[PDB]
Amino acid sequence: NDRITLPPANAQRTNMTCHFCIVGCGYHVYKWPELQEGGRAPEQNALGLDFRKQLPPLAVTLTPAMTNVVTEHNGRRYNIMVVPDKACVVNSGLSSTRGGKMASYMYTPTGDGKQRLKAPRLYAADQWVDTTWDHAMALYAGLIKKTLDKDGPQGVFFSCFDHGGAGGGFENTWGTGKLMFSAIQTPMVRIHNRPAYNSECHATREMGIGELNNAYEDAQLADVIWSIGNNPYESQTNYFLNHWLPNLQGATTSKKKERFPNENFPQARIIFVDPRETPSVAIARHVAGNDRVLHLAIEPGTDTALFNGLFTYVVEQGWIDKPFIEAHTKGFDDAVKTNRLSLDECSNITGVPVDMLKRAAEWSYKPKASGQAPRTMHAYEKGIIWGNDNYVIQSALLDLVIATHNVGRRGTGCVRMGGHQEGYTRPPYPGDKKIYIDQELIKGKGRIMTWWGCNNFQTSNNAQALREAILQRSAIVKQAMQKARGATTEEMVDVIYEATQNGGLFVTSINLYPTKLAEAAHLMLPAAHPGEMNLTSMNGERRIRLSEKFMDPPGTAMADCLIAARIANALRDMYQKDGKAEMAAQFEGFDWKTEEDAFNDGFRRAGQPGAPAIDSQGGSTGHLVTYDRLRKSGNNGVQLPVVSWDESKGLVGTEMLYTEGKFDTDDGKAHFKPAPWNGLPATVQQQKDKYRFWLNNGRNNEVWQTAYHDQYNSLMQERYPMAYIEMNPDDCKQLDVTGGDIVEVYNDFGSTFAMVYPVAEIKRGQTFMLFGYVNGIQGDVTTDWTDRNIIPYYKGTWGDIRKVGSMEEFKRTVSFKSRRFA
């Protein structure tokens, strides 16, 4: 509708980091009784804005989607307004479409959050019902205990978030990790986005370069930005908007010159390595001109060849830092030999013309006239992380970066752009092997599987094999449960345990919402998100912020760290009752009343005297951070690691990593690695050999992840009622499809469905499907293939397309117009 209730001048104001992407944009949450409002005069409302007359452009970001009315546990009603902080350095008052919806996605009884989990849910053999928390713990802890006593920890499976922000963060990763690893001590654990306990960044870390090694200010200071496997307007909006674009526009030139009096700073340029022409390519060309953008539209999976050709060329031209290499690196001469690739071979493999390869090197590595190498920030994400051999691509890319001294200089960095926020503090993983968890589950292993803060039915690789197996195993438990009548909780535990000896699996989901996991889950436990709890996390430049609690969770929904404590204390109590003092002792250390307690126990204990082994993004100075100190810091927080604290200075942190040439390896040097080109994996190549289309996949600007909130939003559902597939118009004509037709996409791995979205910029025999979605799951057609560390090539699959027919309704209501701005 057509009006908004303004926040009163004296309204309560708390800090809130965005729930969603890595950028970690700062917001303020205004909270006030429903029957009060602000006046239009700027000094009579909390915004300080003059609503007596039209506001100019950029004065505010404020829509009805940024407002709500919450009903608290006391039954009292409060207006809320969730709006970007103008003085936050991250976003400077910018809000993406995703963060802009936070108010709407706060829990209310009648709004978009109406189907929030509010109590334990139990599938009692043949129907969903509520149950109590104590019954849920008796069943869940009971099973875990039984499994520990009979099978050991290897019978207990998890797939759990390791990330930051909403459904993650330092309190939550500690809580879950302490439970899984210190208490239960299970190695049968995967991560939300990948099917083993591993890293996205094995190669770069082992080369001595952690993947978040710079500041967002570095994107302002760069001569050149590379965006490799990365659609940052859509996936990291406000980093792109607030930092990248001002550089491309010339707004940061005078700051470069002030820092470096004796260095030329040409107009900044941008290079995209992406098989696909994305909105980010289009918008870059709009802002900077076609002459300052290079789209290296590589063949899918050919990143390694690209970087080996560039590395070879910059070495042959001598566009490298030989003093840097000599003082601070190891293995260069070996990498020159193993990685040798001519520009002609590079061009044949990539499909990129030799002139474009040479130009990219010239922009990026050839000394400027003043003598200094260009400041080239190399930013990468899932196009290579989920690319053709995660480990080898990073090896090849980092070799280029290290040889060109593009780490440790301002305006440089070889960095992840990131996904979620970060907020990792955990004990070490208690196994000595990587385990492909999905494969284990498919093969019939484990008694109990918990999805915690994730939904692999929508997001696993080879997701169809996964769903099939889980549904069937779930059904066996359902069938066994239904023969019970009048059983105690203990008897039920035995019935379910027995069913798991005959192929069954007990499935638990700890979540905000039922999700598609409800098709298989036997138990669902209600969690709480930021604003319903305090939560700490850091963004892509390691900036740690506290998100303040300002409202109650729905019903008995709890902070994930506190659910973990609940589980630990239930297990402890069972062991104490069973007279097993040693097993009880493993479940000590969860005497937690609030999320802060998890912060004190994890983040703040890392590297302290008498602490156990803790792997924390805070490092050993994490104890200097407190909730009260973060509050005083505001949405600016501090860049980790913290270097000092006092009352007069606040938290003082770290802008850029590796500025003195000391890397995270045994000898302090960065290590070059061999990067062989072996083509595509045979599993993926077999799909490519049999089927017509490359089934690229990934993000839409407007849709967040598995659409857990978005599925309930009427605007989102009207815009994207179904997952879409970008198709070349000529391919469309060949298949007799147009916008709003439905197609089956299929291969040897699976079958799924999408609505057709003709896109002129898509190449013939290539496609692009929205990933993770609630209607048409893309991942059914991804292969089982992973690299050496069990990293999937999610961006590597091929399949055929078959027309189902025309969805008239989609044609009447959905725009199929171009999403590439020109």
Binding site: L6, L35, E37, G39, R40, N74, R76
Partner: protein
């Protein structure tokens, strides 16, 4: 206007310590045609005010067809003689059984520790027989 809110009056009811447990006080809010009751329940409830968080207040007009309901001290409910709707004073006017489609409206009370005063400051829910709570 601007304004999205109704202009509720601030009306003194009494001081909290004058209220006896389960002995309803009558007052009118937000005008003399809107009969209301405040009662000390004797035991805390969500959103109760006063020293023992137990004082609640309501419009007594049935939200079905508007008959003045009567407070039953033995059940702590408001009962309507029209079509036998009954509302729970301890569950924010939740309808126990009846023909209404709206909970009994709550009179929002400010409690000031400094003065011991209870002031009616608003209504949560729509009073029967009104386009808006404030006429």
């Amino acid at each position: 206007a601007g304004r999205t809110t109704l202009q509720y009056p601030a009306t003194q009811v009494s001081v909290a310590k004058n209220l006896k447990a389960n002995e309803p006080v009558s007052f009118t809010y937000p005008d003399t045609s809107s009969p209301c009751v405040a009662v000390k329940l004797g035991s805390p409830v969500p959103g109760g005010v006063g020293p023992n968080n137990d004082i609640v207040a309501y419009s007594v007009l049935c939200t079905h067809m508007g008959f003045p309901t009567s407070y039953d001290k033995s059940s702590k409910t408001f009962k309507c003689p029209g079509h036998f709707t009954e509302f729970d004073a301890e569950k924010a006017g939740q309808m126990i059984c009846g023909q209404a489609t709206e909970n009994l409206p709550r009179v929002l009370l400010r409690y000031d520790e400094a003065s011991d005063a209870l002031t009616a400051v608003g209504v949560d829910g729509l009073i029967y027989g009104r386009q808006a709570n404030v006429i």
